[PDB]
Ligand binder design. Structure first.
Ligand SMILES: [Zn+2]
Ligand SMILES: [Zn+2]
Ligand SMILES: [Zn+2]
Length: 178
């Protein structure tokens, strides 16, 4: 097993996957690392099993059909994994916790959003369709772009949105286009 958390890249109290060499802090894994379960398989392993059980799940899909999918267990897991892939980027720190807005010339968003809020909402099964989760994720970056206006800090929202969008296309096997 690796000696650092796969998500935050730090050592500490780590739980080790049984089917691959990754390790995790308890609350870095999503969902949080389960109490018992021997053997235990990480989210990476669980996602790979879905693909192996249904190889055709990798054929291209339209985004509009993906978004309308109900949050059955396999789509729940895919969204958890996509959320985890965002936390994997260190720049996710800017979007993790509850923001506040007091900048000359800007007004805060009408609907603030942040990663830990999305994490709670997934844990509490508050999204009934993939679209709910994707809308809240895209709202994080849109709020940031609007608030920061011409400040160069706007670029952090572009960067982390690009990580989200690339992983969304991968995990949900969105049809490749020019
Ligand atoms: Zn960690
Ligand atoms: Zn694993
Ligand atoms: Zn199949």
């Amino acid at each position: 097993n690796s000696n650092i958390c796969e998500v935050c890249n730090k050592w500490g109290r780590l739980f080790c996957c049984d089917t691959c060499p990754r390790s995790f802090h308890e609350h870095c894994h999503i969902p949080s690392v389960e109490a018992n379960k021997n053997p235990w398989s990480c989210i990476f392993c669980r996602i790979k099993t879905i693909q192996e059980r249904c190889p055709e799940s990798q054929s291209g899909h339209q985004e509009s059909e993906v978004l309308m999918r109900q949050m059955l267990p396999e789509e729940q897991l895919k969204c958890e994994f996509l959320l985890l892939k965002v936390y994997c980027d260190s720049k996710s720190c800017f979007f993790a916790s509850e923001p506040y807005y007091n900048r000359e010339g800007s007004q805060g968003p009408q609907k603030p959003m942040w990663l830990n809020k999305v994490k709670t909402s997934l844990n509490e099964q508050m999204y009934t369709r993939v679209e709910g989760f994707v809308q809240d994720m895209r709202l994080i970056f849109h709020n940031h772009k609007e608030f920061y206006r011409e400040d160069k800090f706007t670029r952090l929202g572009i960067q982390v949105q690009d990580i989200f969008e690339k992983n969304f296309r991968n995990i949900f096997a969105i049809q490749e286009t020019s």
